[PDB]
């Protein structure tokens, strides 16, 4: 199995999982410790945002790749904004802060 691009889930925009659906492989928890254990930071940033979750960045990435520009704009993943609202849907005011 292999996936360039295709479906994304509705609640959070991460890719579907499967062969019965054209899914992307889970870069699961242990793999992230494995990247962190190299120095590899940019790989990780990509793997869990641009390749994955950032609804802007992935379409800007795709176009930069067809243009062959080899550059990314990383943003902030929409699954994390899901978390904020799911906490803020408790009476817990969580918020992003500036300084």
């Amino acid at each position: 199995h292999a996936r360039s691009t295709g479906s994304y889930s509705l609640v959070t925009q991460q890719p579907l999982g499967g062969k019965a659906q054209f899914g992307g492989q889970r870069f699961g928890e242990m793999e992230v410790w494995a990247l962190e254990a190299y120095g590899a930071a940019y790989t990780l940033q990509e793997m869990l945002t641009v390749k994955s979750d950032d609804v802007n960045g992935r379409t800007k990435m795709y176009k930069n790749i067809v243009d062959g520009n080899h550059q990314m704009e990383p943003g902030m993943p929409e699954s994390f904004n899901v978390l904020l609202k799911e906490i803020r849907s408790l009476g817990i005011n969580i918020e992003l802060e500036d300084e």
Partner: peptide
């Protein structure tokens, strides 16, 4: 803030 990203956080924190 580790590895390559440490070196960036460091430059960001040094130009300070």
């Amino acid at each position: 803030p580790a590895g390559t990203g440490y070196a960036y956080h460091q430059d960001r924190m040094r130009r300070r």
